[PDB]
Amino acid sequence: AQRQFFGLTYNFYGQPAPLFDLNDLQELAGCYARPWTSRFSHLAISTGSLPVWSARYPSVASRNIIVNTLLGAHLNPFAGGQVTSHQGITWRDPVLSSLAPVPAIQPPPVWAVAENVPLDSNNYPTYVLNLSSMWPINQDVHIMTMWALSDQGPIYHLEVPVDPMPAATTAALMAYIGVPIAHLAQTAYRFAGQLPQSPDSTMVSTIRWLSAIWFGSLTGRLNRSRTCNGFYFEFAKPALNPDQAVLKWNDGARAAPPAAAQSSYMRCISPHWQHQIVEVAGALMSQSVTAVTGLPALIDEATLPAWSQGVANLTGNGQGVVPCLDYNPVPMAAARHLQWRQDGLITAAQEAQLNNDYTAYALTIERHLTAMLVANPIAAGRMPIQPFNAADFGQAGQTAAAVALAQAMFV
Amino acid sequence: TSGRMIRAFEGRPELLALAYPGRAVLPTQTKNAQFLSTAIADRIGRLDR
Structure with a gap:
């Protein structure tokens, strides 16, 4: 099994402190006051198809975003080699089972506030010793890093080998017929x-x-x-x-x-x-695979935000550097519709209708988020949703290259 | 085969001997014994964590 990982904490958007409050730390959906293996707890039991969100968690991504910000304040052991405390709260045990108020016996040193600190599991030897019980930290930290590196949307990895799908995997795949993507991600x-x-x-x-x-x-x-x-x-x-x-x-x-x-x-x-x-x-789902196997190679810095330029074990500009593509859902849907009529699944009249339907649907998403942003200004103290500008809804990005890759990928 | 994990077959235990040929084979010199001596231990029981 993979015995070492690296990571990076979130970036303050000009604010002076990590953007969460104690109540967020108190109302996690999982076990009390533990961030690990909790990213789906809020929907383990479900009814209907309506998205789940609330006043102080107003977007489907809001909970995970908060968790990432929360972890950014307490991951000092993988940077400084020691457990610390922030606002009188720290871990119960070196295994980092859960967070708790600092005991008045041997108070750990107070954490010094910083952002985008690189992480290395080798700074904290006890993790290797207790790997069998601290394993979920590996997955969650990797997830946080994969989100922290981007100013606009989480980064994940794709790959396809030259050989056909090996038979063993096919035996496993048939267990997942007719299950929606969201359930698959949870699994x-x-x-x-x-x-x-x-x-x-x-x-x-x-x-x-x-x-x-x-x-x-x-x-x-x-x-x-x-x-x-x-x-x-x-x-x-x-x-x-x-x-x-x-x-x-x-x-x-x-x-x-x-x-x-x-x-x-x-x-x-x-x-x-x-x-x-x-x-x-x-x-x-993609990030989960990268978590267990580690990063295949460094990410290209060229299109990433400023703080992500040249991260030690994450980003680079050398030879063995896999490029990163990005896309917009709206043009993507248009391309998907175009493929369907070219393959003859639909007629052009339907394709025109589908684009109209999707664009209208996407418009509501933008309209909801933009209204929700002003309701939760980032200066308030917590960041339930990531800031943006209105023009960001219109960027086409590298969507053309994206569909080109898929055509080159499945042929 | 120490360290591997194998099924139980509680309903009728005689299946246990049949389920995993090769494990705990006597070092006698018989046709079947000679064949079973070539089995690879890693492929007994389950394969994954």
């Missing part, structure tokens, strides 16, 4: 969460393919007329249940393997993701 999160796993594992490679397949269907390159290995994702009309994409197996044609190995990093370049479940689900 993927739990798998890499509880116990340490080897990078070489049937389950790991299974999820890796799942990530690739979903992206291929996302562009519409994969559909019921062109499957990966019989697998593909089925979509509902965006006018209603716009997110209930599920996995299907089919007996039809299969896309041929790529000429060479393909791999890249992906990102959403528009604020839409903060209130769109499928982006969160896809990002987390």
Whole structure:
């Protein structure tokens, strides 16, 4: 199993302190006052399809964002090698089971406030000793890092080998027929969460393919007329249940393997993701794979924000540096619709209607978020939602390159 | 095979001997014994954590 990890904390958007309050620290959905393995606790039991959000957690991404900010204040052991306290709260034990008020016996030193501190598990030797019980820290820290590096949307990884899907993985995949993406993400999160796993594992490679397949269907390159290995994702009309994409197996044609190995990093370049479940689900699922196996290679700095330029174990500009692509959902949907009519699944009249429906749907997302931002100004003290500008909803980004990659990926 | 994990077969235990050929094989020299001597221990029982 992977015995070392690296990470990076969040960046204060000009504010002087991490953006959370004690109540946020008090109302986590999991076990009391523990951040680990909690990113899905708020929807383990569900009814209906309506997104879950509340007054002080007003977006589907809000809870996870808060958690990331929260962790940024207490991860000192992986930077300074010691446990510290902030505003009179610290960990119960060196195993970091949960947070608690500081005891009045041996108060640990007060944490010095800073941002974007690089992290290395080797600074804290006890983690190696207690790996069997501290394993979930590995997954969560990696998740936090993968979000901290971006100013606009979480970063995640894609790859497809030259060989066909190995038989062992196919045996596992049939267990996940007809399950929506969100459920799959929750399952993927739990798998890499509880116990340490080897990078070489049937389950790991299974999820890796799942990530690739979903992206291929996302562009519409994969559909019921062109499957990966019989697998593909089925979509509902965006006018209603716009997110209930599920996995299907089919007996039809299969896309041929790529000429060479393909791999890249992906990102959403528009604020839409903060209130769109499928982006969160896809990002987390891919990130879960990278968590257990580590980063295949450094990320290209060229398109990243300022604080992300040249992170020690994360970003670079040398030779073995995988580029990162980013896209906007609206043009992506248009391309997906275009693929469908080209493959003949739909007629052009339907394609025009689908674009109108989706654009209207996306408009509500923007309208909701922009109204929600002013209701929770970042200067208040906590950041339930990430700041943005109105123009960010119109950026096309590298969407053209994205669909080009998928076409080169599944062929 | 010490350290591996194997199933129980509580309903009728005689299946236990059949389920995992090779484990605890006598070093006698018989045709089946000679064959079973070539089994690889890592492929007994479950494979994953």
